[PDB]
């Protein structure tokens, strides 16, 4: 297990997401679905010039998986995935420059919901999650797990035994008071409100 | 000069953009600025692991250049640029799959302003332009010009004599009744309305 310090500006951003009073937390799902759609666009685009990039899976989709027993919401896509080097770049983000630009925007009247315009929308996961685990597989690397409970660090390790083929899984270990995001009715409502017209199918899995 | 047929679904999309009654044409600028911001994020991200990718220019920005004598509006960025192969892929888009998904969305109640969610927002240029010329330079290829006045085809040729260093210029040859988009007051209004909080600076050039 390798432990890395977050880029300072990201540590500050995460702090702001966790500590600022902001009731509209449901936008985390829009942001993670947007990231999945971007990852899916990338593999689709790459496949136009090299069809063998889909040998690791032809279906391009997003699955939403609530688990009330584990208190987790997982967002899975079959997009391009991330290499170990991507994960070491603050979970595949333009962390430093994006946060700096985002903070200047917040001072000029922007609000937290604009986070995705700055390339750091993944970190909106911390509106609802105490810990986030990212499992990912890119065609050019092995499967890895990235994890952070904030506090200024993240870990990276190889992930074996449950291979995915290609893509990214974002596992949200929800805060105790954010269990509404495990309810089917609530997830459907948020998808229709913010992610109604996406370039890929979204399947909401059922439990028990 | 090489001439290419558009992917059929793109030819249909362009037809729909040119012929459908839709008064909110100003969203073309939001879409082109969004594309520039995405291109700028890509070069910024690539530079995190290879700083020499900025040897072709360190400044990451967007310029908006109106020219009333030529009746053109140009959107310039210093993003990652496009290779010749990208241009041949319908001006660097997921043309086929994106248009198909976008058309299904329009039947389900989506409208033209959602075009950017489907990876084909560049084609919103045809809301206001009779012809579009794209000049582009990627670090791994030479400078090229892509052009189309719709009608089912586009051209690609090398572009010499006015080298850019790195990035993309989108030159909109405006329709005669769309000259409001050359007015400083109008461009400022549209940028503030739709692109107020972007991850990169936008400079609106002055004329005469």
Numbering used by the authors:
A (entry chain A), B (entry chain A): 17 to 224
Paper text:
Here we report the investigation of the role of protein flexibility in the modulation of binding kinetics and equilibrium thermodynamics of drug binding to heat shock protein 90 (HSP90). HSP90 is one of the most abundant proteins in the cytoplasm of eukaryotic cells, comprising 2–5% of cytosolic protein under non-stressed conditions. It is a ubiquitous molecular chaperone intimately involved in a variety of pathways, including cell signaling, proliferation and survival, and protein folding. The N-terminal domain of HSP90 (N-HSP90) contains the nucleotide-binding site, which has been the target site for drugs interfering with ATP binding and ATPase activity. The unbound N-HSP90 has a highly flexible lid segment comprising residues 107–14137.
A change of the conformational stability upon mutation must also cause alteration of the conformational ensemble of the unbound protein in the direction of higher population of the helical conformation (even if such conformations exist only transiently) relative to the loop conformation, which should facilitate binding of the helix-binders.
